[PDB]
Structures are given as C-alpha cells and as structure tokens.
Structure 1
C-alpha cells in the first residue's frame, strides 16, 4: 500500500544530496499516516533511517495534535537516538527537521500551563543546543547549525533576553554559504528584531527587508510575511519614514496590519491624544506580539511630526498657539520641546523668547552671489566619486 512510498523514500538512501531531494517530497510525505502503518516500521526492522522514522513519529503526533508523548518522546527517545546521530555526518542534516519540531512543541507546551519544571527543562534544553551547537560548529554542517542557532535565538526572545542573544551573536559566525532561504529569513528576522529593540533602527530595516526578500511565498509561507511586515511597519515608522498605503494593501495580510494602519493615521497627523487613544484601543491586540513596546516609543516621533507640521505651515507663531495645537499644558513645556526639535535638524528655526514666538528661517536671496557656486561644487564632487566608485566595482569583465 502507501508504505511503498516509505520504501520508495528509502530508495533515496543511496548517497549525499539525494537526502536533500528526499526531504522535499518528504515535506509532503506526511499527508497520510496510520498507527497500523506504524507497524510498517515494525516489519521494516538501519539506524540512519531509525532517526528518520522517529521524524515520522513526531510528524505523526504533532500533526495528530497530541503533544504530550511528543516531547516526552523527544526526551526518552531522542536522547538515546541523539547519541547515535552524533557519529553520523549526514544525520545532522536530517535532525534539523527534528530539532525544528523538538523545541516547537516544548515552546507550544508552555502555552498549556506554567511550571518551573518547564524552566529547568528548558535550561537543560538550551544548554544542550549550545553544546552540540559547538559540536556541529566544529563538524561544519551549515544547515543544522543555522537551524539550531535560530531555535535558541527564538528561545531568548520567548524569554526577555535581548542582550544575552546579542552578545551571543557577537561571538557567532553564521553558516552563510549553504542555507535554506527560509531559515535564512528566520535568522534575518530575529536579527533585525533584537537589533531594533536595542534602539538601533537603521540596521534593523535591513535585516527585515532581507527577511522579506529571502523568504519564500507559496500559500503556506504567509504567516512569516504577515508577522515580519507587522514588524516592518513598526521600524519604518519609528525611523521616521511613513510607509505608503499600498504597503497596507497587499494580500490577506492587510487585515492584520490594521492597527498599524491606525497608527500612521495617528502619526502623520501628529495628534497625540488620538494616538494614545488608539494605543489603548488596540493594545491587547498589539501584545500578542512584542511590537507593542516598540510602538509606545513613537510618542517622541508623533510630537516631532506635530512640530514639523506646525513649522511648515507657519512662518512665526506665538508659543501660546503651538501649545494649543499640541494640547500641552504650558508654554514652558513647549520651548523645551521645540528647542529640542531644532537641535535635531528638524525645524531650522529660532525662537523669540521675550515675545515667545517661533520664527522659521528663510531663503534670504543670495542667488546673485557666489554661494550657489560653492554649493553646486560640493554636490558636483559628490556626484563624481559616485561615478568613480561605480566604475571601480565595474572592473569585472
């Protein structure tokens, strides 16, 4: 019967990259399974396929929705099994699918109940994963390395530890060359994220952008894109660059981005109270991911916007009125906030204190003079070495 495929899959046991191909259909090889079909392996018995059939056990259970003996299985079985696979080199590639599930249910298990047995257990877990993270690191199997790394990163962020994961990266070198683009984007995802929480944005949008590029699409790969982009909007927003509407209308994902689509409406307008109200509105929704405490940083940005708009639309304004448009209590509050905005290269103004009105700087003629010469000159040179550079990297033909 259908077990022929399981035997046909064993016909993939010849050598080397076949396993790769062997995995591909094996991705969908789990469509049909039965406990009596389990007896197939009972009649089938080799170890190099023993671990694999254990994969089939995990896949069987997790899909069958029973997680108890899946993790229980992970321990009692995988540990004996784990020792045998260490000797093998090919097995490391196979185990990655294994590890991918191992952590999973355990993580998923945490959503059943709270116990410190889960703590000690997962301390053991991470400990192991770092152990043969080093072991495999010396064994030079790119794929299983990258996978494992991803799993422990995801552990740090199921935890609250960004730093430990960060300094962890500091001592990491990533198995760059030979990867699975999906794992690559899981990396770039987590990377961009933690790199953001630490308040460095300008490198986060990078790694998340790559998490958009390197990610596959299909119909299944959605949730990763949905989730990521739910982050990408946040970074784009914090950095001070409003995203365009079409970014909010793309695919099914547009139903999820809605709170962010209610943030930019709050942000672009620069109206604080509306913002805050919205944050209270969608808060719980924003907590199911951790984008929340990112978003609550925007209270700075929103006000920056408020000031910049009040500047572009007025040459000079009595402090009274700015304080009215921004709802704030006191003028004294204002000139702290505006004095701040100026230093950041936003307004380009000065402030008249004794009359208390902002005055924004003008263009002051001067075209008939030589200043345009200097300016154009700088711009010119800075165009040259662009041309230069683009011809120095050009050398390759």
Structure 2
C-alpha cells in the first residue's frame, strides 16, 4: 500500500520540476517557464493531500534543506505520526540516475542546482497551513525558511521568479493577523516586513526583471490601505517605476485597483475614475477573481459620485450582479435627489460593510456632495432659474446660501454656469458647438498615437513565437 504509493509519487514530483529548471536556463523567455509552475502548483498540492500528506515529507527529504524538515514533521505528529509510513527506500533514493535528483550534485554539494526545486517544495507546506489557518508563529516559520534560500543558492533572474510566490504568503499572513487584532509581534515585525521587500525592489531594478518588481510593489501598497497609513501610500506613488514588459495582465489590474484608491484620497477623482475602468480592462475573470471584480464595481460607483455627476439607475441593473452592490445602488439614489435624510438612514445601516471596504472615508465627503449634486440636476433642467426657486427645491436657508454652494462647484467644474446678481438668477453656461473649435484635434491626437504604436508592436511579435517553438522539443 503506502510504501509503494509514496515511492512513485516522490519520484514523479522531482522529475517534472527538473525539466522546468532546465527550460529557464536556456536563453530568456520569462513568461512560459513560469506558467508551468502556476498550472503545476494547483495540481501537486491535491495529489500530495490524497494518500496521506506525508507524500510531501518524501519530497522534503529529497531536497537539500536548511530547516524545512522540522516544520513539516510537526504537522504529521499532530494528526498522528506518519514517519513510520514514509520510510527510507521510498522517501530517500538519490539512485544513480537523475529523475529523483542527480547523484553527482548531491554528493559533491557545491555544484548543486537544487534551488528552484527547493522553492516549489516550501510553498506546498505553507499552502496547507494557510488553508487550515495558523497565525503569529506561522508567519515566523515561513519567514525563517524563505530567507535562507536567497542565501545558500545564488540569485539569478530565474531564482527571483519562483521566489516571487514565497514573498506573497509571508506578507499576506502578517496582514491578516494585523487586521485580526494588534499585538506586540505585529507592531515590531511590520517594520521588518515593510523594509525588506523595499530592499529587493532596487535589486530587481538592477536585475532588469520586470515580473519580480511588480509583485513587491503590490504587497507594500496593500499594507498602507489595511492599517490606514496612506500618508505613506501617497509618497510611494510620487515615484513611478512599475514596468509592463514581463508583468502579467492579472497584475496590471492589481496595480490600478489600489492606485485608484490613493488618487481618491488626494481628492483628485479624475485619474481615480480613469484607473478603475482601466483596472477591469487588464483584468481577466473566470471565477477565481470574483471577489476582486465585485469590489471593482463598488469602488467605481463611489468615485463617479465624488466627481458630482450621478451614475444611472440602469447602470446597476445592467451590471450582471446587484447582489452586493445593493448598498451602492441606494447611494446613487440618495445623492441624486438631493436628499439628506436618505443618506443618513443607509450609512448607519450598512456601517460594518462600508468600514471593511475602505469606502467609509469617502462617504464623509459624499454627505457633503448630496447637496452639490442636488444642484446639478436643477441647473441642467432649467437654463435660467432664480436664486429663490432653488431655495424652494433643495430647502436651502437663504438666497445667499445658494450662491456659495454653486460657486465652489464651478471652480471644481461640476456645474459649468455663472451666477448673475444684478438680475437675480443663475444662468447655466452653454457648451456651444465645439466642432468649430480646436477640441476634436485633441481627441484625435490620443487615437492616432495609440494606433501607430500597434502597427510597430505586431512586427516584433512575429518573431517571438518562432524562437519559442525552435527551442521546444520536437512534436
């Protein structure tokens, strides 16, 4: 039974990796060798879990380790010891061939290329403990494995690719503990965590490895959102250094979603709104980004209101879910009529939800924009309307009270109007015909420049598949 099944499972696992180690070491082609690991990770874990998870322990011994072994063993003990079930000759075979790891490198130990193999192994254990959930010490154990692998195996571009997944889970495990509760461990370790990833980022610049740089960036940015120390997130995005050469489409969404949040709290809602539409365009979706995509819709609606021009009632019906967008449909409506009471009732009601989504801060400003967008329907509908008539409609104190609200909005550009005090009415300014002005020449300029860029790009990408195939083993 056990002795056979684990035997065959350990030796298969080593062989699949050894090939993608070889694959990456032959020129540069970053994306494709990587993709092999992403499809593999998902499958390797499920196979290890059936037939007892000490199938990972055979693999763990069949790598040269710095201190992975102790951490893995502890789990086996806990669900009742499985170290007599996975035993040598079936958990330790270097053989005399490489397909359970090369014999010549293992004995010599200074030529060994175990590195990337080793990185894929660690990841498997961290994932199982991540599912189960363990915190505090779980962060410490992960953190203790990961740093040694930078330091016993020499760094390459190739090394940074696969240890880019290692970084994600340390960083992630610390943020979830941080939002659970503050703790003596969390305050102190936050300092190390923030700094060490910033230290790899310039080294990634030196490497010229674009995949690596993006993943470190996204992780720093996220911590600032979680604890609200966005006074930093602002300084972080003064600089730009995010690449787009070897950066995946899935990642490009990631940058733009968070960037959209920072722009909203410098009170520039123009380029916030730009990057949230943008974020969806880069983003793929299937079912595995379903949580992210739901929040993408929610954030867009908050931004559109901040600018002072309502989204439609149809806008949420024509979204293909409204099944968590039910609070922000209510928000479009409440700003829209110019009604203050409706805004109070919903914000209290959905207080826990707003707090979680980092949309509660924007709703202190959106209390303010109830009246500011209240004006926007009335001045639009009626070209000329007295000061006194608008006091009717929005139940405002004084005629003078009207003038103040509208004057702010038109510096921010929301109304596009002018108040006349000698004839006692507000006259909504025209847009005219802009066909006889030089405005369409600006729009075209955007279009022309993007299209020229596509013709040049395609010619480069004729060549790229041809290289990939030539390298590839016969078909």
Single out whichever of 125-134 and 291-300 deviates more from structure 2: 291-300
- Contact 1:185 1:212 survives alignment (8 Å): yes
Cα offset, 1:377, TM superposition: 20
Q: Deviations over 1:46-74 (max 9, x none)?
A: 23211211111111110232345431212
Q: SS in structure 1 opposite 2:462?
A: coil
> Matches of 2:445 and 2:280 in 1, distance apart?
39
Cα offset, 1:182, TM superposition: 1.4
| Aligned pairs, number | 352
Q: CA 1:51–1:198 in 2, change beyond 3 Å: closer, same or farther?
A: same
Q: Mark the runs of 5 or more structure 1 residues left unpaired by the alignment.
A: 1-45
- Contact 2:221 2:258 survives alignment (8 Å): yes
Q: CA 1:252–1:71 in 2, change beyond 3 Å: closer, same or farther?
A: farther
Single out whichever of 253-262 and 222-231 deviates more from structure 2: 253-262
> Matches of 2:268 and 2:422 in 1, distance apart?
39
Single out whichever of 211-220 and 86-95 deviates more from structure 2: 86-95
- The two structures have a TM-score, normalised by structure 2, of 0.61
Cα offset, 1:201, TM superposition: 1.7
Q: 1 or 2 for the larger relative contact order (CA 8 Å, sep ≥6)?
A: 2
Q: Deviations over 1:315-367 (max 9, x none)?
A: 76554443242233333322322444566666676667589655667999999
Q: Mark the runs of 5 or more structure 2 residues left unpaired by the alignment.
A: 1-113, 466-475
Cα offset, 1:88, TM superposition: 3.8
- Contact 1:307 1:341 survives alignment (8 Å): no
Q: CA 1:354–1:276 in 2, change beyond 3 Å: closer, same or farther?
A: farther
Cα offset, 1:386, TM superposition: 19
Q: CA 1:346–1:60 in 2, change beyond 3 Å: closer, same or farther?
A: closer
Q: CA 1:332–1:85 in 2, change beyond 3 Å: closer, same or farther?
A: farther
Q: SS in structure 1 opposite 2:154?
A: helix
> Matches of 2:272 and 2:347 in 1, distance apart?
23
- Contact 2:230 2:262 survives alignment (8 Å): yes
Single out whichever of 165-174 and 128-137 deviates more from structure 2: 165-174
- Contact 1:181 1:216 survives alignment (8 Å): yes
> Matches of 1:375 and 1:185 in 2, distance apart?
25
- Contact 2:270 2:307 survives alignment (8 Å): yes
Q: Deviations over 1:220-253 (max 9, x none)?
A: 1111111122111111222233333454135674
Cα offset, 1:86, TM superposition: 5.3
Q: SS in structure 1 opposite 2:241?
A: coil
- The two structures have a TM-score, normalised by structure 1, of 0.72
- Contact 2:309 2:376 survives alignment (8 Å): no
- Contact 1:272 1:326 survives alignment (8 Å): no
Cα offset, 1:372, TM superposition: 18
